[PDB]
DNA sequence: ATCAATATCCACCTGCAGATTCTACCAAAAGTGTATTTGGAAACTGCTCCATCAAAAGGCATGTTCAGCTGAACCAGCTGAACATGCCTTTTGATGGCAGTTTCCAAATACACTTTTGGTAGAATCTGCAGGTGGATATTGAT
DNA sequence: ATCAATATCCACCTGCAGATTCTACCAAAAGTGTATTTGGAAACTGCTCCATCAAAAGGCATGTTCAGCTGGTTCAGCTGAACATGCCTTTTGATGGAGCAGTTTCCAAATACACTTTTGGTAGAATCTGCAGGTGGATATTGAT
């Protein structure tokens, strides 16, 4: 009668690390639409994975620049504010314990004829 | 008494800028902020309690708001061929961002 | 007299040097003496609005404790989304 | 049923970090920021997709609404690569049924 | 299927005109203005319903009641406008519950 | 069996003009919540009525000051910008054919007859 | 369908002056006009970019007023009077 | 009269301000605006059509945006003890609003 | 502070472009009657917060000293506002395939149930890094 | 330019609080089979965009003059930055205890489902009327002298 071929996750079929079942559950639970198609959560999970990889990549680069092996919020803020597209997308977001980018307006510094 | 060292105005200010822009620690004392929060909340509802992380979150939000406003204020000051920020600069920054009152 | 000492003149705990430090992070080199009182007022306006909304969320849940999530949502409606405290 | 039941995206963020930069860890605070970030972008995309479907009197969310939401919400060069990744994922999923 | 196909399109126009006649009996309103008021009403509708939905979801509640509406009003509207709107809403719910 | 008492409506019961039933239908249709309580649309309709009356009242006053019997978008813009609370709520809204409020910065005005001192 | 080129210059100096006048501006430098044109073009691009996206989703070739309203809405510039 | 009458600079501008602040008619020409819109749209999608109300909506939004920016720009100009607006005023206002240019 | 030109506001006056009013139609609200879900009352858990207090501590307050900023005033000359011509460029008015229904049958997806097993709370383990000494180097100011 | 006085960066060591792994387990993902929804072709269809032209008509590109604004220069008054002491409020780390968020159970109360009956709201065709524009004066604006 029933054979029960072994299970395989949707993430592995899609070649993703982020899940699909949970995203589907979250779309159903949250009043987004009456029904949710099978392809929507794959596309969304892939998008979330790419953007996560982009932030983690730039933050790890900033970490190596400061000779640190662990990513802290400061590195994420530096990564975002130095990247035009991430800065635009996250223009109204505050990263806790992130600080600010170094920036002194040129006219407030003393004149360079000092010697 | 003999030949005492004294830095010129601006050097130490710049050193403080460099220092605080390099670090991320919170600059306001926790307890006075807690007392301010409790006073304000008390004027809306009595005997309120607070989680410690709620106060820390408010501190982060407040400081981010002030730093952004001081940056805009500084650009307004520089625009007027000045280097000193004045109340009229804050009022202008607040008006353009739409934080009118 | 059980608890909850009345809170009065606590805005002065936001001292001049802390405001100076915040201005320094903003790149300000020189600060007029009249800035400090104005800044204190500005902060109070922001906080009141935030706390007003946070406590409203508290009241809807029939809770007496303000959580971090209530603050995050209150800030979201003011367009100053905060990351790092859950959600 | 003890002590409680929570959930996060923590395990998935760590995998991406290990694939892109094998020799790197992550603090608990930073992981919290990424979870907040993911939830925010999730809400933004799903909310926009919902509005589009309502305007077009459609009760179903398909890969088309997500793609469109991405092009509206993300800026310039970021959207094309995200769309390409989503498309490749959908084609691989439909092929590997 | 009728011989002359023609659609339907709802608006809040007639109710706005009734309110206008109540507040200023000797006054009309242009079609553009009525359209602006309809847009306004739709905007406040979406804002309140969306916020109430969000509040309900955060507290794991599946029902939107007059409580969430009241709270939404207090969050979105300022001061005395909020107090008067709340009073009108409370009066209406109390009259409805009795006037079955 | 049936009596089928003559139809009454919820707007009439609440003493309102705005449509409770339609608001109820709009909440159900729009993915706001799975279920909707009976009191929510009454309260919301009442709020919308109050706001409509306030706006129309102020625009009508501006219209009478201009000696016009019909309200145009301009009168609504003038009403909104002269009311602190409506301006806050509608701080990021553009009213088509509304224009702007008259406002000239004092510095832009001529010196005075003190320049024509004679 | 004729190709359109060099058309931002149809937004003439006096129209920009009139707009500045409504803004309460009394005197205007000559270099403002080109800068203003560029600013307007950017704004328009973003709106049209979003409007056409809504159009494409519905498989329509006509941009409606509602598409523009929604594009403006997501940019925080809600417009009343042209529908919904 | 021997010499034609001429108002001094700073009078006609004020008359124009009062006139345009009293009226609501659109100040940009319909035709060049429509042509520009079609030109910009062409680089994104081919063979597009436009409803007339879409162009009127875009015109209302554009003029309201520019008017708001000129108000803020004028306050920035006045702040610098000037009465003449310059490009640097627009750039400052747009920077404080958070717009990418 | 009187005089020329000027623009702008104030009273009639008309037909016309809407704006209001009124019949017919019907989707859509409301009225019964059942089923199915619930949010509020009560109880029990234990755990996060609050008040208060004994002892450094490094932060802040006042009080001095002064280089350097602000604001005001003054002038060269350049700038852009008024204004007269006459011409493009815009305005209005004729004239000649794509958005919105209807149907369908079939891709796609809800709904119930069972099965597997991935994620998560918590005990063990590991390890990057704050902190602390210390040396060598980069900025700074008076001279 | 020269040189003593302070800051900054790096090299190194060492204990450790926070990050990473291994158990255990249970609520949720995933496969299977009924039954249900609606999405893309395919055929109307009517209506409203697109060029195109021709007659105006008025706003604006050009060019001219000239009031007056900007920005450079000088400089006197004051005034916040910097720094030396002494109070003294914030930090830590306990000690006690207390009352409230969280979870569970059970319930009368409240809302969806499904059907029928009935009517306010829209669409279109008929009347009402407020006012854009035009006509004619009266008087606040502005400026020259």
Please check whether strand I approaches the CB of H83 to within 7 Å.
no
> Can you tell me the distance from the alpha carbon of F107 to that of F52, in angstroms, rounded to the nearest whole number?
38
Q: Which residues contact B32 (CB under 8 A, 6 or more apart)?
A: C10, C13, C14, C15
Q: Using the CB atom, is residue B6 less than 7 Å from strand J?
A: yes
C62 near B52, Cβ under 8 Å? no
What's the rounded Cα separation, in Å, for the pair F14 and F11?
5
> CB of B5 under 7 A from strand J?
yes
Task: Please report the number of interchain residue pairs, chain B to chain C, with beta-carbon separation below 8 angstroms.
Answer: 165
Fold of the domain spanning D1-97: Histone, subunit A (1.10.20)
Residues 6+ apart with CB under 8 A from B88: H79
By CB atoms closer than 10 A (0-12, 13-18, 19+), residue D92 is: middle
**Paired sense of beta strands F70-71 and D25-26, if any:** unpaired
Tell me which residues of chain F, numbers 59 to 118, contact chain H at a CB-CB cutoff of 8 Å.
73-74, 94, 96-105, 107-110
Flag whether residue F31 sits within 8 Å of chain D, measured between CB atoms.
yes
Domain residue limits at A49 = 1-115
Tell me, yes or no, whether chains B and H touch by having 3 or more C-beta pairs under 8 A: yes
Can you give the C-alpha Rg of chain H in angstroms? 19
Among residues B96, E30, D21, C64, the alpha carbon closest in space to that of H99 is found at B96
Instruction: Report whether G78 contacts F92 (CB < 8 A).
Output: yes
Pick the CATH number of B1-101 from 1.10.20.10, 3.90.1520.10, 3.40.50.970, 3.40.50.200: 1.10.20.10
Do C and D touch, 3+ Cβ pairs within 8 Å? The answer is: yes
Q: In terms of CA atoms, which chain B residue is nearest residue H81?
A: B80
Can you give the distance from the CA of residue A1 to the C1' of nucleotide J142 in angstroms?
103
H17: CB within 7 A of chain J nucleic strand: no
What are the structural domain ranges in chain E?
1-100
Rounded to the nearest 10 degrees, the angle between the axes of helix G32-58 and helix G65-74 is: 110
**By the CB < 8 Å criterion, does E31 face chain F?**
no
Distance CA C26, CA B71 (A): 5
**Contacts (Cβ under 8 Å, ≥6 apart) of H37:** G44, G48, H50, H55, H58
Q: Touch between chain H and chain E (3+ CB pairs, < 8 Å)?
A: no
CA distance readout (Å), C25 to A108, B63, C21, D18, E94: 14, 10, 6, 34, 54
Which of D27, D32, D44 should we substitute to test contact with C (largest number of C Cβ atoms within 10 Å)? D32
CB contact under 8 A, F34 and A33: no
C18 CB inside 7 Å of strand I: yes
Residues of chain A contacting E57 with CB distance shorter than 8 Å: 30-31
Radius of gyration of chain D (CA): 17
Q: Which chains neighbour H (Cβ–Cβ under 8 Å, 3 or more pairs)?
A: A, B, F, G
Q: What is the number of domains present in chain A? A: 1
Q: Domain spans of chain H?
A: 1-101
C66 beta partners? B50
Range G1-84 has CATH code 1.10.20.10: yes
Give the strand pairing for A93-95 and C81-83: parallel
Chain A neighbours, 3+ Cβ pairs < 8 A: B, C, D, E, F, H
Burial of G73: CB neighbours in 10 Å, binned 0-12, 13-18, 19+: middle
Judging by beta carbons within 10 Å of its beta carbon (0-12, 13-18, 19+), is residue H55 exposed, middle or buried?
buried
Residues 6 or more apart whose Cβ sits within 8 Å of residue C19: B66, C35, C36, C39, C40
Output the CA torsion C9→C13→C14→C18 (10° steps).
160
Residue G22 CB in 7 A reach of strand J: no
Q: CB of G29 under 7 A from strand I? A: yes
Who among F36, F85, F96 is closest to E64 (CB)?
F36
Report the C-alpha dihedral over residues A12, A13, A16, A20, rounded to 10 degrees. Answer: -90
Residues of chain A contacting residue D12, judged by C-beta atoms under 8 Å apart? 17-19, 49
Q: How far apart are CA B72 and CA B81, in angstroms?
A: 15
CA distance A30 to chain E (A): 7
Q: At what angle do helices C35-61 and C68-77 cross, to 10 degrees?
A: 120
Q: Report the C-alpha gap between H61 and H59 in whole angstroms.
A: 5
Which DSSP string corresponds to chain F?
----PPP--HHHHHT-SS-HHHHHHHHHTTTS-SEE-SSHHHHHHHHHHHHHHHHHHHHHHHHHHTT-SEE-HHHHHHHHHTSHHHHHHTTTEEETT--------GGGS---TTTT--
Where are the domains positioned within chain C? Answer: 1-87
Q: Does the CB of E31 sit below 7 A from strand I?
A: yes
* Residue D53 touches partner A, C-beta closer than 8 Å: yes
Nearest-CA distance B88 → chain C (Å): 9
Which positions in chain G touch F104 (Cβ < 8 Å)?
Answer: 24
What are the tokens at H56? Answer: 């009127």
Match 């109820």 to its residue by tokens.
F24
d(CA G26, CA F108): 7
Taken in order E32, E34, E36, E42, the sign of the CA dihedral is: negative
Which DSSP string do the residues of chain D spell out, in sequence order? --S-----SHHHHHHHHHHH-SS-EE-HHHHHHHHHHHHHHHHHHHHHHHHHHHHTT--EE-HHHHHHHHHHHS-HHHHHHHHHHHHHHHHHHHHT-
Secondary element (H or E) of residue G11: none
Query: Which residue in A76, A74, A78, A27 sits closest to A52, CA to CA?
Result: A76
E-assigned strands of G3-69? 27-28, 62-63
Topology of the domain comprising E1-100: Histone, subunit A (1.10.20)
State phi, psi for B8 to the nearest 5 degrees: -70, 155
DSSP class of residue A103 equals -
Q: How many CB atoms lie within 10 A of CB H80?
A: 17
* Contact yes or no for F80/F86 (Cβ under 8 A): yes
Any chain D CB within 8 A of the CB of A30?
yes
G65 Cα distance to chain centroid: 13
Distance (Å, whole) CA D52 – CA D62: 11
Enumerate long-range contacts of H44-52, CB under 8 Å, 24 or more apart.
H44/G48, H44/G49, H44/G52, H45/G52, H45/G55, H45/G56, H47/G1, H47/G61, H48/G52, H48/G55, H48/G61, H48/G63, H49/G61, H49/G62, H49/G63, H50/G62, H50/G63, H51/G62, H51/G63, H51/G64, H51/G65
Apex H69 CA angle, H64 and H74, nearest 5: 125
Nearest alpha carbon to residue C59 among E68, E48, D61, A6: E68
Can you list the alpha helix ranges (DSSP code H) found in chain H? 12-22, 30-42, 52-79, 87-97
Cis status, amide bond into B100, omega within 30 of 0: no
Q: Write the CA distances from E44 to B6, C73, E92, F33, F51, integer angstroms.
A: 62, 19, 19, 17, 10
How many Å is the Cα radius of gyration of chain B? Answer: 19
Q: How far is the CA of C11 from the C1' of I50 (A)?
A: 22
Token readout for B72 is 């805009």
Per CATH, domain C1-87 is 1.10.20.10: yes
- Asked if D60 and D53 count as a contact pair (C-beta separation under 8 A), the reply is yes
Q: Are C65 and B51 in contact (CB under 8 A)?
A: yes
Nearest-Cα distance to chain B for F53, in Å, is 26
Chain C within 8 Å of A69 (Cβ-Cβ)? no
- Contact between residue C13 and residue B35 where contact means Cβ atoms under 8 Å apart: yes
Long-range residue pairs from B13-20, CB within 8 A, at least 24 positions apart, any chain: B13/C24, B13/C29, B13/C30, B14/A104, B14/A109, B14/C29, B16/C21, B16/C24, B17/A104, B17/C24, B17/C25, B17/C27, B17/C29, B18/A102, B20/C21, B20/C24, B20/C25
Give residue for tokens 């309120």: B48
Measured CA distances, F45 to E22, E74, E85, F21, F49 (Å): 16, 16, 10, 10, 6
What span, in angstroms and rounded, lies between the C-alpha atoms of F15 and D96? Answer: 61
Given a contact cutoff of 8 angstroms between Cβ atoms, the answer to whether A52 and D38 are in contact is yes
Rounded (5°) CA angle G11-G12-G16: 85
Rounded distance, CA A91 to CA A80, Å? 9
Nucleic strand I under 7 Å from the C-beta of F102? no
Method by which the coordinates were obtained: cryo-EM
Which single residue is written with the structure tokens 């979201």?
A: C76
E50 part of contact set with chain A, CB < 8 Å: no
DSSP 8-state assignment for residue H47: S
Cβ-based neighbours of A93, under 8 Å, separated by 6 or more: C81, C82, C83, D40
A28-50: burial string, b at 16+ Cβ within 10 Å, e else: eebbbbeebbebbbbbbbbbbbb
What distance in Å separates the CA atoms of residue E97 and residue G53, rounded to the nearest whole number? 47
Residue G82's closest CA among G70, G66, G71? G66
Resolution (A): 3.5
Query: Which pair of tokens denotes residue G10?
Result: 């149809």
CB F76 within 8 A of CB E33: yes
Q: How many CB atoms lie within 10 A of CB H88?
A: 15
Alpha carbon distance E91, E70 (integer Å): 12
B20 and C CB contact within 8 Å: yes
Nucleotides of I under 7 A from a protein CB: 1, 4-9, 18-20, 26-33, 37-40, 47-52, 59-61, 67-71, 79-84, 89-92, 98-103, 108-110, 115-122, 128-130, 140-143
Phi, psi of F95 (to 5 degrees): -95, 110
Q: What is the CATH number of the domain that holds A83?
A: 1.10.20.10
Q: How far apart are CA A57 and CA H14, in angstroms?
A: 57
Rounded distance between C-alpha atoms, residue F117 and residue G2, angstroms: 63
Closest CA to G37 of B43, E22, H87, F3: H87
- DSSP H helices, C4-67, are 16-25, 35-61
């Amino acid at each position: 009668g029933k054979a029960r071929a072994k299970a395989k996750t949707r993430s592995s079929r899609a070649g993703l690390q982020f899940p699909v079942g949970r995203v589907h559950r979250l779309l159903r639970k949250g009043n987004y639409s009456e029904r949710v198609g099978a392809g929507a959560p794959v596309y969304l999970a892939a998008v979330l994975e790419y953007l996560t990889a982009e932030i983690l990549e730039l933050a790890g680069n900033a970490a190596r620049d400061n000779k640190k092996t662990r990513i802290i919020p400061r590195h994420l803020q530096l990564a975002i504010r130095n990247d035009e597209e991430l800065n635009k997308l996250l223009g109204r977001v505050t990263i806790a314990q992130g600080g600010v980018l170094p920036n002194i307006q040129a006219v407030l510094l003393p004149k360079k004829t000092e010697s | 008494v003999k030949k005492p060292h004294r830095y010129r105005p601006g050097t130490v200010a710049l050193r403080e800028i460099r220092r605080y822009q390099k670090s991320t620690e919170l600059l306001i004392r926790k307890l006075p902020f807690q007392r301010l929060v409790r006073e304000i909340a008390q004027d809306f509802k009595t005997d309120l309690r607070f989680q410690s992380s709620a106060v820390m979150a408010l501190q982060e939000a407040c400081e981010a708001y002030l730093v952004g406003l001081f940056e805009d204020t500084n650009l307004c000051a520089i625009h007027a061929k000045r280097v000193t920020i004045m109340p009229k600069d804050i009022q202008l920054a607040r008006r353009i961002r739409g934080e009118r009152a | 007299k059980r608890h909850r000492k009345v809170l009065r003149d606590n805005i002065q705990g936001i001292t001049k040097p802390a405001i100076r430090r915040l201005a320094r992070r903003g790149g300000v080199k020189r600060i007029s003496g009249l800035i400090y009182e104005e800044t204190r007022g500005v902060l109070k306006v922001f906080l009141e609005n935030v706390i007003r909304d946070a406590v409203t969320y508290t009241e809807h849940a029939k809770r007496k404790t303000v959580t971090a999530m209530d603050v995050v949502y209150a800030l979201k409606r003011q367009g100053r989304t905060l990351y790092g405290f859950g959600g | 049923r003890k002590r409680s039941r929570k959930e996060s995206y923590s395990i998935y963020v760590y995998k991406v970090l290990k694939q892109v930069h094998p020799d790197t860890g992550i603090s608990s605070k930073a992981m919290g920021i990424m979870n907040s970030f993911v939830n925010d972008i999730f809400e933004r995309i799903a909310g926009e997709a919902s509005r589009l479907a309502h305007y077009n009197k459609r009760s179903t969310i398909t890969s088309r609404e997500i793609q469109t939401a991405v092009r509206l919400l993300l800026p310039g060069e970021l959207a094309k690569h995200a769309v390409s990744e989503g498309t490749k994922a959908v084609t691989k999923y439909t092929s590997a049924k």
